[PDB]
Amino acid sequence: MLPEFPKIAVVAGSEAESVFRVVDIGTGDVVYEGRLSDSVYDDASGDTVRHADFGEWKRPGSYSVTVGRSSSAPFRIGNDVYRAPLIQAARSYTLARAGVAIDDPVTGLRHDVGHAQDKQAMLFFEDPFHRQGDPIDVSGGWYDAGDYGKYVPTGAVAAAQLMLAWEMRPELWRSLSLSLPAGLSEPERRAGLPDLLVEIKYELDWLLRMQRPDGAVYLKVAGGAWPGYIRPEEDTADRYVFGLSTYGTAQFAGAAAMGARVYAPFLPDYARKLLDAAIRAQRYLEQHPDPEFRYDEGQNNGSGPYEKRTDREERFWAAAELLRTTDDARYDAYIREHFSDFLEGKTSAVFWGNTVLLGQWAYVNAERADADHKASVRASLTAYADELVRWASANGYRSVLRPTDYFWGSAREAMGRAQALLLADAVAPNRAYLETALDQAHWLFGRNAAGTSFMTGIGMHSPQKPHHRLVASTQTLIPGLVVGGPNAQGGDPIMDRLLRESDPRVFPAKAYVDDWEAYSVNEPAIDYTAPAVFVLTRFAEDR
């Protein structure tokens, strides 16, 4: 917990108690005694919960909350408390790199070069630039999740969210070491690039390799079958380039246009390479206005589908990010002609299937965007943020999730909503936005009905058996990874059995188990961790 922010312990049950005591563990002295709030039933969990509010106690230290016969696990009040998880989450991307050997003394993660054969991955179909089966260098980038596939939509959206974390607090990140393992990114490190930007560039370099000469971008790199729980160097099967999509082409353009701005102070040639690539993608999109999602039979036999057959929110982001980076007012005209609805509303949390908020954020920060339309976008952001505050303020776990939000990726959604609250705070400062965003980090780290952190390596309870082939094959804890979170819709054989056999039925906020095969709730992904990095950036102490 931070000294200057709200402090509530959430207690499920304990209906009969009326007071609580905050005890300094080092002295045994009570530093704060108060009355518990009234018990209130929580629809998503089935829990009856109340609060111990001790926000006025601000002294750093280690404490426990006593209620009746029980005392909480120790917790910290301190200014420094979110720096370590931020660092862990950010450097988890390094440990997810494809195409390199890793020997990390921090975690002990060690593996030989994985997927070197991505340097000659075979195109799964014929296109105007390559025969079916022709090799393409699509090496590098990050493994997506617990598998070894590499997918443009989540790679672009994750890279963009990490770049927005950079832009939120560049001076924090300039002095933040990710303890990059030996041999990695040696030219970038010799050049003094901040470690976060070194890591993001590994993914941008790969995204650039997924673009064809006409500007369009392929969908993903993977094999024809899912590997077992094996080290990446053991996954020697042929690799393929699959798919072609307009929404992924637009997401690439958004990420590359953002990277052009972010990298320009450091690497003028690389920044211009990114911008030219972004504009080639945008020009492909302007010349091919209809959505496309290419599907060849078999392309999902060994990798996730990431299918979206419309693309408006992503085309909007591409154009708005280009507007922000280039200051070319022709992009404002284009946006106003085709995407006026996104200038007047429809804010929703960022994820790979809807980047409208990345576009809205670019637009409101664009010097050459129309002023009245920037005002409209700010109001869309604050209306959405106000709704999140209303929900969370009345929720016993101070959660921005409703019972119907417990589907695949709920933990991402909590942190994406927290991200939206912080973007709203940037355009229209409001302490409630900042506090509610921080409440979602409290939730993520275990203040929730499932009684577990959804970030590895953090919390009294955390995921120990994430559906993750590197963790499983090396039996090595990688901290800072965010798993999907509770999901009442099923999707893997463990959760499917739990949900169908349970009587009474599982409450949605508890639809979670820590098991290797529970991949509908317990698989980490780069686009789950990315909004958590963004949110923690705001609350990490600088030095």
Author numbering: 1 to 543
Sentences from the paper on this structure:
J30, an endoglucanase with activity against p-nitrophenyl cellobiose (pNPC), which produces cellobiose as its primary product, was identified and analyzed from metagenomic data originating from a switchgrass-adapted microbial community. Its likely source is the moderately thermophilic bacterium Thermobacillus composti KWC4, and its catalytic optimum is 50°C. It is annotated as a GH family 9 member consisting of an N-terminal Ig-like domain and a C-terminal catalytic domain. The predominant architectural element of the catalytic domain is an (α/α)6-barrel structure composed of 12 α-helices arranged in an alternating pattern as is typical within GH family 9 as well as other families.
